[PDB]
Design a protein around this ligand. Structure first.
Ligand SMILES: [Cu+2]
Ligand SMILES: [Cu+2]
Ligand SMILES: [Cu+2]
Ligand SMILES: [Cu+2]
Ligand SMILES: [Cu+2]
Ligand SMILES: [Cu+2]
Ligand SMILES: [Zn+2]
Ligand SMILES: [Zn+2]
Ligand SMILES: [Zn+2]
Lengths: 333, 333, 333
């Protein structure tokens, strides 16, 4: 690793993913990243409910980091003195020392640099895991995805090449917002004051909200995902704490790695797939119809009542072969 | 599609599935179906609890529709003036327009005809999805399965032929029946009056009942499924809203497509498989022993306490090679 | 089976597994086991909460039974007169008579001997299932694993040999301990007195505790699992009632059969896998780094708050290629 060239990557905010190659002629590199932790109060729904949140780089999820199999990830993790809590990082893509958590314990005002070999292909969760407060830091927003691409790109079960034209990253967050005796959600002045009441809600195993990318409706309206007929999209879906079941309404998972590990053959033609709590999965889809799709957790209560749903707006020409309204709604003859 | 022959299929009520070919020499057809929505109050347990239910064709689940890959499904959906609500249909097997929901919005007194290409093999959920009330219509009973068989029939991982001699269809329904201050389940005069209280229960993510085919014990006694030693059964299991884990007590899943898509290789020898909320899965089993089996969700609380269990009564000759009582229960020597 | 040699196996307590061969030159045998049921009050957490427990052989889980495909399992099940309840056993690995439950109904003071053919390879749950009280006996602790190894040992997707150097067995138990009006957990004088209150908690679908091998912290401290760099461990994980998502913190599932059936190809490089309620799964991992790992259910609330987490202490030499602390935590420059 000490023999290798270094490259520095500039991260981009979800739902985008930073520029990268799929199949590459390049040899292994030490790939350098930096992230800065930000604790902040965030508004998470349409009625002004707040979360005392904790983030990598100011977003939920943290940004997606992309490397190739055989690369080394070298992350500088910064915990500004403006934060109240200690933090660290655990990479599921890494081997040893609790995913790196033991080597990256940063108090406010400190930083650390971790290197690990990305020797396994796939999408992998990374998350904060400070001893004694792991689930709180995770459910408060401290997770994201590391994608390790095979050096020769994605492959189907027969070893044929697969690709995406655009990648989107979706972090799904089960939130545990406490209520007061009046039945309204509690607003806390500081992160520390949210703790005890939040642990109590967590222990019920019942989320108050389940959101994509930090808020009900985050991936809707002006902020809907976009694509065009004929384009192949990769949808990366991470859930660091709780199971989810992604579904594209009006579409499919053409090729899906629901356990998120690219050396395994993908499944095809899925209606709904399953992302295990503590993992990231990946689905390819090539659009064949224009229109607005929903991308959601298909526990429909979790999607429509609790917030786990987004939109994809797709341009292009309608295909009557695939679907046709033979008779529009009309009175029964 | 406009060049093709049409065929009309008469649907049958669950747990049966309408007559169809597996492997077929026939070419693609436009396959015509009709379903009529029925809102009705249904008794769902042994103690007289009622559900303000919503159904395709008067049953939970709706009937299973069977076509072959490359066929076109052409469904006439009828919403009689006797119903109170608007409805539509979203086929997970279809491509575009939110699965067809956008093209089939029928007010009471109206009907519509949708065509789509069944270009992907597998078992696929279909369900109602009226804008603004999706989870309510789904959990109240509006879902069923479309099975798209490969034109050359089912195949094992090595591409060898597989078949079933009899097919059964099981829809599992997580129900959310509200209670009054007295702790008894509420009975509502109309469908609309159940709504607000039901949404509140839904948001707890805790079903009051979880039933196969519309009621606790639906598939038991006179209504148990049946088979014989040597017969291969296909068990289609749909759950449009919540995860389940089917298990045949005393048997196995010989070949299982738990994600329900036939172009993927099945798994063999399963004890328990997993049907993701928002999907239908399929399992083959060849009976080797006579007797009464249970087919259930193997969260045993969900099965035995909440209602997610049925029976299969199997005729034939006992096999002592497979299992033998060496010593019957007797006092400890 | 009446032509075959018999062997008698002495069972060992979890988390160990009794001595056995993987690949074997031996032909099929009748393999004889005995287990004795023990009802007992057990302390399940650090604050003195008790469970009115029910066990195979005095442990949660029951011991793991290991045979080879084509062997016959012959179990003598003993229910001492000191117990209060009737019991039986249902082997998911068996064919017929509700897994053997119908043939092994033993009142206190009785015993029975069941034989069945272990004709399917994999890890399979076994559990008590007395008519009318199935979920109670299961959640109170009456489950364990039968492992049926292929006669030629484990194989990867390409049919290459796989092995483990050490096997550990982990039973995960969702517990349903009732509380009194004071908010403290109830302590019951007898097993029968726990029943009604426990059924009420069960019906909420919310466990009070979720534990590995009978107690919070069971597999920690003096009782942590152990291994060494270069050693391959098999981690058998059973959950007879509820879904779980195992994860090795700082490691991976090198080869995983999450549905637990060895005739299916395993998946590689998993971060987190999924064990369906009512099943046992198996994961291989070869250690590459020394240190203390956590092995946990990656619903981190379930792990850290409710008890579903253990430790593995690993000896050997640190590998800087795999992971290196480039800069230890230090003030931000
Ligand atoms: Cu943190
Ligand atoms: Cu983790
Ligand atoms: Cu409807
Ligand atoms: Cu749907
Ligand atoms: Cu028992
Ligand atoms: Cu069972
Ligand atoms: Zn493309
Ligand atoms: Zn047959
Ligand atoms: Zn070894």
């Amino acid at each position: 690793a000490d023999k290798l060239p270094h490259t520095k990557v500039t991260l981009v905010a979800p739902p985008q993913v930073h520029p990268h190659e799929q199949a590459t002629k390049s040899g292994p590199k030490v790939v350098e990243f930096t992230m800065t932790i930000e604790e902040k109060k965030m508004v998470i729904d349409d009625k002004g409910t707040t979360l005392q949140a904790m983030t990598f780089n100011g977003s939920m999820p943290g940004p997606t980091l992309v490397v190739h199999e055989g690369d080394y990830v070298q992350l500088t993790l910064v915990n500004p003195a403006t934060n109240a809590m200690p933090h660290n990082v655990d990479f599921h893509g890494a081997t040893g020392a609790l995913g790196g958590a033991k080597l990256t314990n940063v108090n406010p005002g400190e930083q650390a640099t971790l290197r690990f070999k990305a020797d396994r292909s796939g999408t992998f969760v990374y998350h904060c895991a400070p001893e004694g407060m792991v689930p709180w830091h995770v459910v408060s927003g401290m997770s994201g995805t590391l994608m390790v691409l095979p050096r020769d790109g994605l492959k189907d079960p027969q070893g044929k090449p697969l690709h995406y034209d655009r990648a989107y990253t979706i972090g799904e967050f089960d939130l545990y917002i406490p209520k007061g005796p009046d039945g309204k959600y509690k607003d806390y002045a500081t992160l520390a004051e949210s703790y005890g009441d939040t642990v109590q809600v967590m222990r019920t195993l019942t989320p108050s909200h389940i959101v994509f990318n930090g808020k009900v409706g985050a991936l809707t309206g002006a902020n809907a995902l976009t694509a065009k007929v004929g384009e192949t999209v990769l949808l990366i879906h991470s859930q660091a704490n709780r199971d989810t079941r992604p579904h594209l309404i009006g579409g499919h998972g053409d090729w899906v790695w629901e356990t998120g590990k690219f050396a395994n053959p993908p499944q095809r033609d899925l209606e709904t797939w399953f992302i295990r709590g503590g993992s990231a999965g990946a689905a390819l889809y090539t659009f064949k119809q224009p229109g607005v799709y929903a991308y959601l957790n298909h526990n429909l209560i979790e999607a429509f009542e609790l917030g786990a749903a987004g939109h994809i707006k797709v341009e292009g020409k309608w295909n009557d072969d695939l679907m046709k309204q033979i008779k529009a709604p009309a009175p029964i003859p």
